[PDB]
Amino acid sequence: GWIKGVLVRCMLNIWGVMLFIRLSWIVGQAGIGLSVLVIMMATVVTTITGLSTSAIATNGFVRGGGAYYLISRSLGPEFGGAIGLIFAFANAVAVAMYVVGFAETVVELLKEHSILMIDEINDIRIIGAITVVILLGISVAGMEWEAKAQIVLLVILLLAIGDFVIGTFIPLESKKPKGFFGYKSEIFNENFGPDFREEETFFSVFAIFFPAATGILAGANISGDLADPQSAIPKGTLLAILITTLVYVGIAVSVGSCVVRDATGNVNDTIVTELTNCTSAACKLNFDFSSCESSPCSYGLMNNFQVMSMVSGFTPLISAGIFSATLSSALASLVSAPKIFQALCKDNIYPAFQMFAKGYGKNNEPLRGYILTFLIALGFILIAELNVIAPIISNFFLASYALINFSVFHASLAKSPGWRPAFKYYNMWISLLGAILCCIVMFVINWWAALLTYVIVLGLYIYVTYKKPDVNWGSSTQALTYLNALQHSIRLSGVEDHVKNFRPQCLVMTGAPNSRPALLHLVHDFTKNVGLMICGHVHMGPRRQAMKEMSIDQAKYQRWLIKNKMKAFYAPVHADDLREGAQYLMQAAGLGRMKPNTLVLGFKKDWLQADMRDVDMYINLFHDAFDIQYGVVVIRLKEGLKNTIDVWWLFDDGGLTLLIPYLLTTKKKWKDCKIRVFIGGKINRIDHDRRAMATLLSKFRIDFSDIMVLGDINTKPKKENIIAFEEIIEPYRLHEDDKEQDIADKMKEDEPWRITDNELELYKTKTYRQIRLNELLKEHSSTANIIVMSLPVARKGAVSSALYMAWLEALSKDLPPILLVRGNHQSVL
Amino acid sequence: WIKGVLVRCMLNIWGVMLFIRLSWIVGQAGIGLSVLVIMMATVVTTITGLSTSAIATNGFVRGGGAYYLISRSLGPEFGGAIGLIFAFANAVAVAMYVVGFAETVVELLKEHSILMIDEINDIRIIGAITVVILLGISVAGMEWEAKAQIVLLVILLLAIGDFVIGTFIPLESKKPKGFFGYKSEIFNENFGPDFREEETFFSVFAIFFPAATGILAGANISGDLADPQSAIPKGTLLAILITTLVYVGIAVSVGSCVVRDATGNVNDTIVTELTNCTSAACKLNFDFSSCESSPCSYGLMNNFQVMSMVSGFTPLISAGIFSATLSSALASLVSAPKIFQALCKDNIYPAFQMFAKGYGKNNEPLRGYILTFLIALGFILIAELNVIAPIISNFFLASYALINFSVFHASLAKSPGWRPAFKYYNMWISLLGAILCCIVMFVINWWAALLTYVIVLGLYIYVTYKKPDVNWGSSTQALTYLNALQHSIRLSGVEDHVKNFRPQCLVMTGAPNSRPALLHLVHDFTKNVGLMICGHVHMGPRRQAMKEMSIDQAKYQRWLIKNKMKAFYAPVHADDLREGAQYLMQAAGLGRMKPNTLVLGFKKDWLQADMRDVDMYINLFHDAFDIQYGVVVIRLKEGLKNTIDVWWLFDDGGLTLLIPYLLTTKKKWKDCKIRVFIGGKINRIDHDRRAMATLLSKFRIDFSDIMVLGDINTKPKKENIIAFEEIIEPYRLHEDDKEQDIADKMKEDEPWRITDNELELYKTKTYRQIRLNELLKEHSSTANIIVMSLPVARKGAVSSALYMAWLEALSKDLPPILLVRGNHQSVLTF
Ligand SMILES: NS(=O)(=O)c1cc(C(=O)O)c(NCc2ccco2)cc1Cl
Ligand SMILES: NS(=O)(=O)c1cc(C(=O)O)c(NCc2ccco2)cc1Cl
Q: Changing residue 206 to C does what (chain A)?
């Protein structure tokens, strides 16, 4: 069955080098009891990882054939990328262990057949060379043949285990010079002793052993897609762990009972009565032990690593059994690691490794990953000591396992996704303790490599927390990000005080985001990572086809706006005219705390050639903005496209107009600019005004250059400027005094935005003032980047729309990019 | 200014070990190794000081306290962790310095005639007495600290100057001990390391570290200066510099006077003749007897207070020792409990809220005092200062590494509240310092470092989710606020295409406090799959609208936070209900987080209600349909086996099925047992059965049963029909029964009247909408939630009264009933 397929592949993954190659040395180095405790602790850590993989696998939705795919969809890329990289590296380097064990077994065979190879130590590497160069071909070719031969090759392992357990119980005379005795309880008593260690310790042998009981993840998740892969696989993996554990415990007990720790291949040593001091622990026979305290026995349990091969019955078959085991485990590792690495490369988490996504094979099967794994595997083959290779393999596998356990616990604690484990056996604390014990056992063994590994993990944490990925949650798992944003906004709704932070938000009413790009850039400069600005577009069109064009325009403008990286959300509405859409955006747009409070408008430079009722619409838009207590911002900027950023604070307004330049300075674009504040005041009072204004300026900490308090206000500008203003308002001046009263009343009633004569004499001083400030701006702030000035206003209906726009024309007439502002009454800080 | 922080750092750093253990350190590690230890500890301290200066510069000019400075700069997590670790570290540092005082006193008593007990017990008793006297003084001692600090620094500098003068002054009587006049050969001999008693370089570094610690108290103890932003760095770092200089200005100097092995007796004096002199001692006059064989009385290895012996007129250096010990004791003992009280105040850790209260002449945490004094007096149990030091060294290293890594995390993550505003600061350098601190901790007392790592990991795990989800505790909203901002871009920047349909509903109920049952029920299936926007329209004068508008917003936000709903209360002002609903449905939401369906609690008791209200209510349905929203209504009874009856009768895009599926995936409705009713005429049952089965398999409902009814579209019982006719009787326009003129001017009098022609036209529709009521009554008498496809009609074709009466008849007297209709776009989208 499919569960039988997962179980057979997990049997194949777990049963590698240490089924027979090294387990003799472990059982002889510490003892039967200590070895069994090693098996138990390795089973504990492996089963904690199995529970974590069950928890991630049993998520509601199932997709993807890769292990990295499942770990990345189930939990965010923050841990997913690190787990993928670490496990890919570990699985790539496990090939080294498996093939070097293969080569050592071949060497053991060839020592008896061939008298001596030219370079025995390097013979392991020269054999590993042919093994890897043929294993790459086996991995890239005949995948279906390998899948069909899975069962055939694992039958070899089952036959080998049966062979050895058949051999161990029965006594035999064929292996008489060597250490072969059958289940003698004296052997158990004399081998249970922990005090067998030679240059190695308990945790060292645990570290060397650990590769045997690891690899469950590759069996579970490399397949990814099969019959019922979401729920039924984890039960197969837990049963896999149980079966492998029982096999290892039983085989360890049998080996410890059978073989003596030190056996010399000699016919002698058979003493009729050696009850005196019983130099041999098996004092009854003593066939094979003598003078091995001085000259150690060659064929002993701890001395001979492959004693189980020769001492078991029908020894030719067992060698082929290990051969199949190691080649199978190596090929599984060599096919599993590169695909994980390619999945990680396809994810844009690590652009430095982006070049590895090649897919040279027609049916995927990446080749560059194979080449990289080839290189690293051979480089690790360059070590001929398996007892030395094992600590690194255990190091990286333990790193990956601890990272998996901690990531699963993190998902359980911080519930951002739909992280609902369907396996009741999972518990967050159990996985946490598993991760802690994994980290501790990591520290204990080969501490320097452990510290290097923690440094690497912390470096990946740095790299991910800075460069955030955009592949997986961007496609088919945007729900994770949606829940992220929703939970963060709900958290935001928790805050209860608003007085501390004014925190400007800019609802920008540009016609379209692509239109007036300079305006968008400028407004984004002083509102970026300090507040959200919303590009509001009041769409015009028929009702029937409204929503479709809404959607298409929203998509197009959002793509354009993210291309020219902005922090803006395109919010379109439908309304009969601009004012209604503005009302919609002002009163309803925004959620909880992220609600716009300042209304940004581009100056209507084409008001002269446009219908005034739309300009009247514009001024009514200003007045509606003031009613809801918004801060009005107007930008006039020459669309046809380094010293200072001048400020012209005149009226108290609010704290917003002095706040705008500050945020401009910190963006590194206006960093090399100096704020030259201008504030009006009395001629007798500049010094007092200078100190009084410097107090507030220091409070705003905008590091003012100076405060050129001036008294040129309330002055007739000149003959020509008033002439120009008269020319500006001439097409709309209403000559009631010159014309008949009846016709003047008719013109007023049919059309109300005329500038009545009384309006001119009522507001003559205001017009003089506005022209005065215009000419002062021309004289002083001509060579400045971004002028800031308090926005002139008037009571609703007290001033006609035409004259109000005339004032805004006069003030911002010939200046560089200017930024008129009038905030609300409340102070910003 | 300078005197505010430079003096405090001078008097803090130069604690007890400079005056006793530094000479022993030079004994264990050679002059080169001693200087290497000095520079390494100085690098740690300088990196910590630079990080502290960056913290001070960031955020704002002034803060309530160092705890609050760190809290503003980063937030609750790192600030609370640093505060707790540093408070514990100062609590045990009090123990260190008082043990130093105790050992000096007991050594003096050894010099003195009488002895009370053996050495370890004398330390215990005298240290306890001094700790309780320090209790008496320290509880109220802020008035004289400003005057006392300068005098104590003067005394300490007098002691240091006395040592310097005594270094160049030899004397023949004291020459048997390690007392010589700046001889070069002894300096050469002392250059080489001599590590004895199984003491090693990093172990000596471990003991030494607390001597070069205490800079953080420069800003922690008090600000209150003319320029707190500028005064804190320029002092503290400066202090560190001279500290190291004085340390090295002592270190090599020590090696210039004192021999590594000496004995007091003058008898063992070599005769001036050609002798072997393996040791440099008999170079001058003194053979000794190779004191490595037998433990000698003095010689920088057995007389710790050797610096007291060298300086002429040793009472002054002894008094300097007293001054340094007491000064560092007061500094740390005032620093720690204030931090602990601040941690209680910020409410990051609810388990310790009982310790916030304080009282006295000025409110101070006497509880925090008593607990720190108790635990410190517990730590006095170990009377060996060499044993004491490594634990405090580990805590200081943990605190400094945590501070440096906190600065790095603020700088790297582009923290919204972070701004370096410092001339010479590099986040990479802070990382390097913190990392080296981590390895150094792991090197010394590996189990203790493991314990600290476990504690900090547990605190991090506690403060990641358990605290913030309920209440993070920080008073600076910005560090949260701005964060959410970018996440919204993360939601808007992702191209969702069309495969991102989720239930995002706004519940158009004016008063959230009223009708909480509907809010809880809709939040039940909107808890973790979408946003709930309890929109609220307000009608009133524009003059006072805004103020009361915000008042209502705040009050109802408090109410929704008091209960457990994940809902944003976004209210608007409008002329009437329809305009406000239009405002919400057109502009509410930002990015892709926009409402998609319009929950409307049924207008129960509409009988007494005016007809204009009902007209606007039905026009809300029509507007929602026009603007491509899903309409869901609910008739929960306001008084507020197990099965949820889903009557999928009209293909609405799967919403009618999706909603109960969301209900099931929750704790409350785990026992759901959905029963799916379908409508179909007489035909093969298998067609409908398998079609509905595969449709449910698509959306993963996992039906308990699928059942089909053929009794729809049949004539209902006569009593029910006449009951409905009497229901619609007050609004019925019997135009046929009455005269034509009356009906006419009544119709142009009120457009909502229902002509009998409407009843004739939709007689079969009313028959369906009442027969379905009878069927759901007899079949589904008991049911948790009855989710039913919502009837629809042409806009304006039927008078709103008749449409609303249809909706009322379909839910006449029922358990929780939930009518649903959606846009035909959620085709297996979820
Ligand atoms: N600043 S303006 O008067 O020239 C202006 C101008 C426009 C504009 O029409 O471009 C605009 N958008 C409304 C719109 C209609 C159709 C598409 O967008 C808003 C404004 Cl404030
Ligand atoms: N769900 S409902 O039709 O019965 C309804 C019910 C209410 C309601 O709570 O009365 C409501 N609030 C309007 C309001 C008036 C004053 C303040 O808010 C709106 C609606 Cl749509």
A: Reduced cation-chloride cotransporter activity
> What is the enclosing helix (H) or strand (E) of A440?
helix A428-444
Please tell me chain A's helix, strand, coil percentages from 3-state DSSP, rounded to the nearest 5. 55, 5, 35
Q: Which of A508, A538, A583, A615 to mutate to test the pocket of ligand 1 (most atoms within 8 A of CB)?
A: A538
Given phi > 0 = left and psi -120 to 50 = alpha, else beta, which region is B597? beta
Residue with tokens 């991630």: A56
- Hey, are the CB atoms on A567 and B465 less than 8 Å from each other? no
Backbone angles phi, psi at B14, to 5 degrees: -80, 75
Q: Show the domain range for B51.
A: 2-470
Question: CB contact, 8 Å: A497 with chain B?
Answer: yes
**B626 to chain A, minimum CA–CA distance in Å?**
9
Q: Give which of B687, B697, B695, B706 is closest to B646, Cα–Cα.
A: B706
Q: How far is A323 from chain B (nearest CA, A)?
A: 43
Residue of A nearest to B464 (CA): A414
Q: What is the dihedral of CA B616, B622, B625, B630, to 10 degrees?
A: 50
Q: How far is B480 from chain A (nearest CA, A)?
A: 7
Query: What is the Å distance from ligand 2's center to A505 Cα?
Result: 30
Q: Could you write out the DSSP letters of every residue in B493-517? A: HS--TTS-----EEE--S-SSS-HH
Inter-chain residue contact B542 with A627, CB threshold 8 Å: yes
What token pair was written down for A477? 């798992």
CATH code (residue A44): 1.20.1740.10
Resolution in A: 3.9
Ligand 2 center from residue B535 Cα (angstroms)? 10
The letter for the amino acid at B119 is E
In this structure, what token pair is assigned to residue A710?
């001036």
- Strand ranges for A70-186 from DSSP E: none
- Report in angstroms the alpha-carbon separations of B798 from A266, A578, B615: 110, 33, 11
Do the Cβ atoms of A591 and B528 come within 8 Å? Answer: no
**Contact between B294 and B263 (Cβ < 8 Å):** no
Which residues fall within 8 angstroms of residue A59, CB to CB, at 6 or more apart? Answer: A73, A74, A230, A418, A419, A420, A421, A422
Q: How many CB atoms lie within 10 A of CB A314?
A: 10
CA distances (Å), origin B445, targets A279, B6, B390, B398: 43, 33, 8, 13
The DSSP call for residue B790 is P
Nearest to B491 among A470, A481, A562 (CB): A481
